[PDB]
Amino acid sequence: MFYGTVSSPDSGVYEMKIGSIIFQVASGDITKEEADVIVNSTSNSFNLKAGVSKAILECAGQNVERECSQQAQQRKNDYIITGGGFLRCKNIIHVIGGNDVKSSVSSVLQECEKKNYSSICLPAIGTGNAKQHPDKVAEAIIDAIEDFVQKGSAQSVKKVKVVIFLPQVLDVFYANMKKREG
Ligand SMILES: COCC(=O)Nc1cccc(NC(C)=O)c1
Ligand SMILES: [Cl-]
Ligand SMILES: [Cl-]
């Protein structure tokens, strides 16, 4: 229906088309990535400093931490959008690691279209302190992209990359891609 073939354009990187979007996975440090949006998997108070969130908030800087607590004390947010600070992005989207991962990724995609952005980089959302299972997280991330494509919503978004802290979790994402392959 939408899925292309799984291949490797670089050592340790795996990709496939999902409609007009190139979907990629790799292991490494997400704070070294460049993309229009980088996603942070945080807590419901937007101030977690454990797992990948520690590295993202430290590298982003204190002006970003204050955007987070200022917005947190304004309304009940499901996610928040901040500046990039010292990360190589235009915005950070902070999602709640314990929330439904398909819902969180759908919201990220919609917000990126609203800004006419082309590239997104995210971690394996919820696999840190939220302790969601890696298989369920992989299934949810890829389902969200499939649904966005199916609805004809992808216009500006062309590349979605998951940069994963543990190589063992990358293996789970690769297997999920091969299950879907066209
Ligand atoms: C030494 O461990 C540092 C670390 O980041 N661990 C770690 C381990 C497993 C998953 C995740 N992921 C997220 C989203 O936080 C992080
Ligand atoms: Cl998490
Ligand atoms: Cl991760």
PDB file of C-alpha atoms and ligand atoms in Angstrom:
ATOM      1  CA  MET A   1       0.000   0.000   0.000  1.00  0.00           C
ATOM      2  CA  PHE A   2       2.747   2.481   1.014  1.00  0.00           C
ATOM      3  CA  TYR A   3       5.908   0.554   2.053  1.00  0.00           C
ATOM      4  CA  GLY A   4       9.115   0.390   0.025  1.00  0.00           C
ATOM      5  CA  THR A   5      12.141  -1.915   0.471  1.00  0.00           C
ATOM      6  CA  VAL A   6      14.455  -1.921   3.544  1.00  0.00           C
ATOM      7  CA  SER A   7      18.134  -1.105   2.723  1.00  0.00           C
ATOM      8  CA  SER A   8      21.258   0.343   4.373  1.00  0.00           C
ATOM      9  CA  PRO A   9      22.621   3.652   2.919  1.00  0.00           C
ATOM     10  CA  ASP A  10      25.432   3.812   5.558  1.00  0.00           C
ATOM     11  CA  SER A  11      26.968   1.432   8.124  1.00  0.00           C
ATOM     12  CA  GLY A  12      24.496   0.943  10.975  1.00  0.00           C
ATOM     13  CA  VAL A  13      21.710   2.990   9.275  1.00  0.00           C
ATOM     14  CA  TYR A  14      18.566   1.337   7.828  1.00  0.00           C
ATOM     15  CA  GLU A  15      15.817   2.984   5.758  1.00  0.00           C
ATOM     16  CA  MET A  16      12.579   2.454   3.883  1.00  0.00           C
ATOM     17  CA  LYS A  17      10.031   4.631   2.120  1.00  0.00           C
ATOM     18  CA  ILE A  18       6.566   5.051   3.682  1.00  0.00           C
ATOM     19  CA  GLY A  19       4.736   6.864   0.863  1.00  0.00           C
ATOM     20  CA  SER A  20       6.597  10.148   0.271  1.00  0.00           C
ATOM     21  CA  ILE A  21       8.531   9.952   3.610  1.00  0.00           C
ATOM     22  CA  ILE A  22      11.986   8.362   4.033  1.00  0.00           C
ATOM     23  CA  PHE A  23      11.936   6.507   7.423  1.00  0.00           C
ATOM     24  CA  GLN A  24      15.387   5.838   8.920  1.00  0.00           C
ATOM     25  CA  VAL A  25      16.769   4.217  12.106  1.00  0.00           C
ATOM     26  CA  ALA A  26      20.310   4.237  13.597  1.00  0.00           C
ATOM     27  CA  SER A  27      21.948   3.935  17.082  1.00  0.00           C
ATOM     28  CA  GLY A  28      23.861   6.885  18.620  1.00  0.00           C
ATOM     29  CA  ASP A  29      23.654  10.175  20.519  1.00  0.00           C
ATOM     30  CA  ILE A  30      20.601  12.199  19.391  1.00  0.00           C
ATOM     31  CA  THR A  31      22.078  15.478  20.757  1.00  0.00           C
ATOM     32  CA  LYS A  32      24.617  15.458  17.863  1.00  0.00           C
ATOM     33  CA  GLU A  33      21.877  15.317  15.183  1.00  0.00           C
ATOM     34  CA  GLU A  34      20.703  18.161  12.898  1.00  0.00           C
ATOM     35  CA  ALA A  35      16.953  18.305  11.939  1.00  0.00           C
ATOM     36  CA  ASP A  36      14.167  20.897  11.772  1.00  0.00           C
ATOM     37  CA  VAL A  37      12.671  19.266  14.907  1.00  0.00           C
ATOM     38  CA  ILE A  38      14.289  17.101  17.603  1.00  0.00           C
ATOM     39  CA  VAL A  39      11.864  15.254  19.928  1.00  0.00           C
ATOM     40  CA  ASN A  40      12.501  14.900  23.726  1.00  0.00           C
ATOM     41  CA  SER A  41      10.828  12.027  25.697  1.00  0.00           C
ATOM     42  CA  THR A  42      10.220  13.669  29.109  1.00  0.00           C
ATOM     43  CA  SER A  43       7.800  13.630  32.081  1.00  0.00           C
ATOM     44  CA  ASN A  44       4.370  15.273  32.548  1.00  0.00           C
ATOM     45  CA  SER A  45       6.179  18.234  34.227  1.00  0.00           C
ATOM     46  CA  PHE A  46       8.573  18.722  31.284  1.00  0.00           C
ATOM     47  CA  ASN A  47      11.657  18.639  33.587  1.00  0.00           C
ATOM     48  CA  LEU A  48      12.958  15.044  33.513  1.00  0.00           C
ATOM     49  CA  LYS A  49      16.757  14.800  33.546  1.00  0.00           C
ATOM     50  CA  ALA A  50      17.126  10.981  33.287  1.00  0.00           C
ATOM     51  CA  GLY A  51      17.956   8.882  30.243  1.00  0.00           C
ATOM     52  CA  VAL A  52      18.134  10.753  26.920  1.00  0.00           C
ATOM     53  CA  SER A  53      16.200  13.753  28.450  1.00  0.00           C
ATOM     54  CA  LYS A  54      19.231  14.507  30.664  1.00  0.00           C
ATOM     55  CA  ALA A  55      21.471  14.897  27.573  1.00  0.00           C
ATOM     56  CA  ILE A  56      18.848  16.915  25.616  1.00  0.00           C
ATOM     57  CA  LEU A  57      18.161  19.439  28.441  1.00  0.00           C
ATOM     58  CA  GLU A  58      21.891  19.852  29.286  1.00  0.00           C
ATOM     59  CA  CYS A  59      22.869  20.428  25.628  1.00  0.00           C
ATOM     60  CA  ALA A  60      19.806  22.688  24.899  1.00  0.00           C
ATOM     61  CA  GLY A  61      20.574  24.968  27.917  1.00  0.00           C
ATOM     62  CA  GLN A  62      18.858  26.949  30.693  1.00  0.00           C
ATOM     63  CA  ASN A  63      16.770  29.247  28.450  1.00  0.00           C
ATOM     64  CA  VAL A  64      15.023  26.040  27.158  1.00  0.00           C
ATOM     65  CA  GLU A  65      14.496  24.717  30.756  1.00  0.00           C
ATOM     66  CA  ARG A  66      12.741  27.984  31.677  1.00  0.00           C
ATOM     67  CA  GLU A  67      10.489  27.812  28.520  1.00  0.00           C
ATOM     68  CA  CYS A  68       9.472  24.324  29.755  1.00  0.00           C
ATOM     69  CA  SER A  69       8.468  25.310  33.392  1.00  0.00           C
ATOM     70  CA  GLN A  70       6.829  28.611  32.178  1.00  0.00           C
ATOM     71  CA  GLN A  71       4.623  26.712  29.742  1.00  0.00           C
ATOM     72  CA  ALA A  72       4.002  23.877  32.291  1.00  0.00           C
ATOM     73  CA  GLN A  73       2.541  26.443  34.740  1.00  0.00           C
ATOM     74  CA  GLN A  74       0.034  27.822  32.106  1.00  0.00           C
ATOM     75  CA  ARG A  75      -2.240  24.916  31.078  1.00  0.00           C
ATOM     76  CA  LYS A  76      -2.442  21.121  31.187  1.00  0.00           C
ATOM     77  CA  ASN A  77      -0.218  20.347  28.118  1.00  0.00           C
ATOM     78  CA  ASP A  78       0.013  16.925  26.392  1.00  0.00           C
ATOM     79  CA  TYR A  79       3.291  18.221  24.799  1.00  0.00           C
ATOM     80  CA  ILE A  80       5.153  21.495  24.454  1.00  0.00           C
ATOM     81  CA  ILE A  81       7.134  23.259  21.704  1.00  0.00           C
ATOM     82  CA  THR A  82      10.285  25.245  22.612  1.00  0.00           C
ATOM     83  CA  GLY A  83      13.215  26.752  20.992  1.00  0.00           C
ATOM     84  CA  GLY A  84      16.287  24.584  20.049  1.00  0.00           C
ATOM     85  CA  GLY A  85      18.784  26.362  22.280  1.00  0.00           C
ATOM     86  CA  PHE A  86      22.235  24.916  21.580  1.00  0.00           C
ATOM     87  CA  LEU A  87      20.893  21.859  19.770  1.00  0.00           C
ATOM     88  CA  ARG A  88      21.077  21.815  15.947  1.00  0.00           C
ATOM     89  CA  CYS A  89      17.349  22.259  15.297  1.00  0.00           C
ATOM     90  CA  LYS A  90      14.687  24.960  14.835  1.00  0.00           C
ATOM     91  CA  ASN A  91      12.427  23.636  17.618  1.00  0.00           C
ATOM     92  CA  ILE A  92      12.334  20.885  20.282  1.00  0.00           C
ATOM     93  CA  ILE A  93       8.986  19.117  20.751  1.00  0.00           C
ATOM     94  CA  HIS A  94       8.824  17.690  24.335  1.00  0.00           C
ATOM     95  CA  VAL A  95       6.440  14.705  24.529  1.00  0.00           C
ATOM     96  CA  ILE A  96       5.414  12.730  27.671  1.00  0.00           C
ATOM     97  CA  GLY A  97       7.195   9.336  27.655  1.00  0.00           C
ATOM     98  CA  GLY A  98       4.288   7.564  29.425  1.00  0.00           C
ATOM     99  CA  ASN A  99       1.598   8.767  26.963  1.00  0.00           C
ATOM    100  CA  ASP A 100       0.285   6.760  24.005  1.00  0.00           C
ATOM    101  CA  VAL A 101       3.259   6.792  21.596  1.00  0.00           C
ATOM    102  CA  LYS A 102       1.125   6.701  18.393  1.00  0.00           C
ATOM    103  CA  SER A 103      -0.762   9.813  19.619  1.00  0.00           C
ATOM    104  CA  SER A 104       2.487  11.637  20.486  1.00  0.00           C
ATOM    105  CA  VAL A 105       4.092  10.931  17.073  1.00  0.00           C
ATOM    106  CA  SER A 106       0.822  11.972  15.242  1.00  0.00           C
ATOM    107  CA  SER A 107       1.018  15.329  17.104  1.00  0.00           C
ATOM    108  CA  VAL A 108       4.722  15.821  16.215  1.00  0.00           C
ATOM    109  CA  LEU A 109       3.949  15.185  12.475  1.00  0.00           C
ATOM    110  CA  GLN A 110       0.990  17.631  12.495  1.00  0.00           C
ATOM    111  CA  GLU A 111       3.057  20.372  14.193  1.00  0.00           C
ATOM    112  CA  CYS A 112       5.907  19.936  11.691  1.00  0.00           C
ATOM    113  CA  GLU A 113       3.465  20.323   8.726  1.00  0.00           C
ATOM    114  CA  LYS A 114       2.075  23.519  10.337  1.00  0.00           C
ATOM    115  CA  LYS A 115       5.655  24.966  10.255  1.00  0.00           C
ATOM    116  CA  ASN A 116       6.433  23.642   6.716  1.00  0.00           C
ATOM    117  CA  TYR A 117       9.325  21.592   8.172  1.00  0.00           C
ATOM    118  CA  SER A 118      11.005  18.760   6.203  1.00  0.00           C
ATOM    119  CA  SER A 119      13.026  16.707   8.780  1.00  0.00           C
ATOM    120  CA  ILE A 120      12.353  15.160  12.227  1.00  0.00           C
ATOM    121  CA  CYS A 121      14.665  13.212  14.592  1.00  0.00           C
ATOM    122  CA  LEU A 122      13.223  11.332  17.622  1.00  0.00           C
ATOM    123  CA  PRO A 123      14.394   8.799  20.251  1.00  0.00           C
ATOM    124  CA  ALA A 124      12.612   5.470  21.021  1.00  0.00           C
ATOM    125  CA  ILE A 125       9.934   7.461  22.952  1.00  0.00           C
ATOM    126  CA  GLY A 126       8.956   5.950  26.347  1.00  0.00           C
ATOM    127  CA  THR A 127      11.740   3.297  26.547  1.00  0.00           C
ATOM    128  CA  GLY A 128      13.661   5.181  29.304  1.00  0.00           C
ATOM    129  CA  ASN A 129      12.127   6.004  32.669  1.00  0.00           C
ATOM    130  CA  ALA A 130       8.566   5.386  31.356  1.00  0.00           C
ATOM    131  CA  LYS A 131       9.555   1.681  30.797  1.00  0.00           C
ATOM    132  CA  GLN A 132       7.319   1.081  27.771  1.00  0.00           C
ATOM    133  CA  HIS A 133       8.288  -2.079  25.890  1.00  0.00           C
ATOM    134  CA  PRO A 134      10.560  -1.485  22.812  1.00  0.00           C
ATOM    135  CA  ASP A 135       8.456  -3.677  20.467  1.00  0.00           C
ATOM    136  CA  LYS A 136       5.231  -1.798  21.261  1.00  0.00           C
ATOM    137  CA  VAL A 137       7.067   1.577  20.877  1.00  0.00           C
ATOM    138  CA  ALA A 138       8.450   0.586  17.416  1.00  0.00           C
ATOM    139  CA  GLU A 139       4.983  -0.598  16.283  1.00  0.00           C
ATOM    140  CA  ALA A 140       3.377   2.705  17.430  1.00  0.00           C
ATOM    141  CA  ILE A 141       5.943   5.039  15.843  1.00  0.00           C
ATOM    142  CA  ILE A 142       5.702   3.342  12.416  1.00  0.00           C
ATOM    143  CA  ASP A 143       1.836   3.052  12.660  1.00  0.00           C
ATOM    144  CA  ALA A 144       1.616   6.847  13.253  1.00  0.00           C
ATOM    145  CA  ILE A 145       3.648   7.572  10.073  1.00  0.00           C
ATOM    146  CA  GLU A 146       1.562   5.098   8.021  1.00  0.00           C
ATOM    147  CA  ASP A 147      -1.698   6.733   9.164  1.00  0.00           C
ATOM    148  CA  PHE A 148      -0.381  10.284   8.398  1.00  0.00           C
ATOM    149  CA  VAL A 149       0.567   9.145   4.856  1.00  0.00           C
ATOM    150  CA  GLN A 150      -2.740   7.287   4.337  1.00  0.00           C
ATOM    151  CA  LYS A 151      -4.740  10.449   5.196  1.00  0.00           C
ATOM    152  CA  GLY A 152      -2.757  12.473   2.572  1.00  0.00           C
ATOM    153  CA  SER A 153      -1.291  14.733   5.289  1.00  0.00           C
ATOM    154  CA  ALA A 154       2.421  14.507   4.282  1.00  0.00           C
ATOM    155  CA  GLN A 155       3.314  17.547   2.168  1.00  0.00           C
ATOM    156  CA  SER A 156       6.344  19.316   3.721  1.00  0.00           C
ATOM    157  CA  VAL A 157       7.625  16.339   5.875  1.00  0.00           C
ATOM    158  CA  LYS A 158      10.149  14.222   3.876  1.00  0.00           C
ATOM    159  CA  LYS A 159      12.431  12.517   6.443  1.00  0.00           C
ATOM    160  CA  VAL A 160      11.739  10.923   9.857  1.00  0.00           C
ATOM    161  CA  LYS A 161      14.791   9.421  11.664  1.00  0.00           C
ATOM    162  CA  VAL A 162      14.798   7.485  14.991  1.00  0.00           C
ATOM    163  CA  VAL A 163      18.237   7.732  16.738  1.00  0.00           C
ATOM    164  CA  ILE A 164      18.244   5.049  19.426  1.00  0.00           C
ATOM    165  CA  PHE A 165      20.485   4.998  22.539  1.00  0.00           C
ATOM    166  CA  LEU A 166      20.842   1.165  22.804  1.00  0.00           C
ATOM    167  CA  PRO A 167      21.895  -1.032  19.865  1.00  0.00           C
ATOM    168  CA  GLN A 168      19.628  -3.832  21.196  1.00  0.00           C
ATOM    169  CA  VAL A 169      16.586  -1.557  20.665  1.00  0.00           C
ATOM    170  CA  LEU A 170      17.720  -0.740  17.072  1.00  0.00           C
ATOM    171  CA  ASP A 171      17.489  -4.537  16.390  1.00  0.00           C
ATOM    172  CA  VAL A 172      13.766  -4.454  17.422  1.00  0.00           C
ATOM    173  CA  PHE A 173      13.035  -1.473  15.075  1.00  0.00           C
ATOM    174  CA  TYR A 174      14.834  -3.208  12.152  1.00  0.00           C
ATOM    175  CA  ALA A 175      12.687  -6.380  12.636  1.00  0.00           C
ATOM    176  CA  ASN A 176       9.501  -4.256  12.628  1.00  0.00           C
ATOM    177  CA  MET A 177      10.560  -2.562   9.335  1.00  0.00           C
ATOM    178  CA  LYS A 178      11.203  -6.003   7.718  1.00  0.00           C
ATOM    179  CA  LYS A 179       7.684  -7.203   8.817  1.00  0.00           C
ATOM    180  CA  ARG A 180       6.141  -4.262   6.852  1.00  0.00           C
ATOM    181  CA  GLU A 181       8.379  -4.299   3.793  1.00  0.00           C
ATOM    182  CA  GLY A 182       6.696  -4.082   0.340  1.00  0.00           C
TER     183      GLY A 182
HETATM  184  C1  LIG B   1      23.466   4.911  30.796  1.00  0.00           C
HETATM  185  O1  LIG B   1      22.127   5.102  30.329  1.00  0.00           O
HETATM  186  C2  LIG B   1      21.820   6.351  29.736  1.00  0.00           C
HETATM  187  C3  LIG B   1      20.553   6.295  28.912  1.00  0.00           C
HETATM  188  O2  LIG B   1      20.207   7.270  28.243  1.00  0.00           O
HETATM  189  N1  LIG B   1      19.866   5.145  29.015  1.00  0.00           N
HETATM  190  C4  LIG B   1      18.720   4.733  28.290  1.00  0.00           C
HETATM  191  C5  LIG B   1      18.460   3.359  28.256  1.00  0.00           C
HETATM  192  C6  LIG B   1      17.361   2.875  27.574  1.00  0.00           C
HETATM  193  C7  LIG B   1      16.506   3.737  26.907  1.00  0.00           C
HETATM  194  C8  LIG B   1      16.735   5.116  26.942  1.00  0.00           C
HETATM  195  N2  LIG B   1      15.819   5.921  26.194  1.00  0.00           N
HETATM  196  C9  LIG B   1      15.306   7.128  26.516  1.00  0.00           C
HETATM  197  C10 LIG B   1      14.245   7.662  25.581  1.00  0.00           C
HETATM  198  O3  LIG B   1      15.664   7.761  27.526  1.00  0.00           O
HETATM  199  C11 LIG B   1      17.843   5.608  27.632  1.00  0.00           C
HETATM  200 CL    CL B   2      11.176   7.887  28.583  1.00  0.00          CL
HETATM  201 CL    CL B   3      16.274   5.867  22.783  1.00  0.00          CL
END
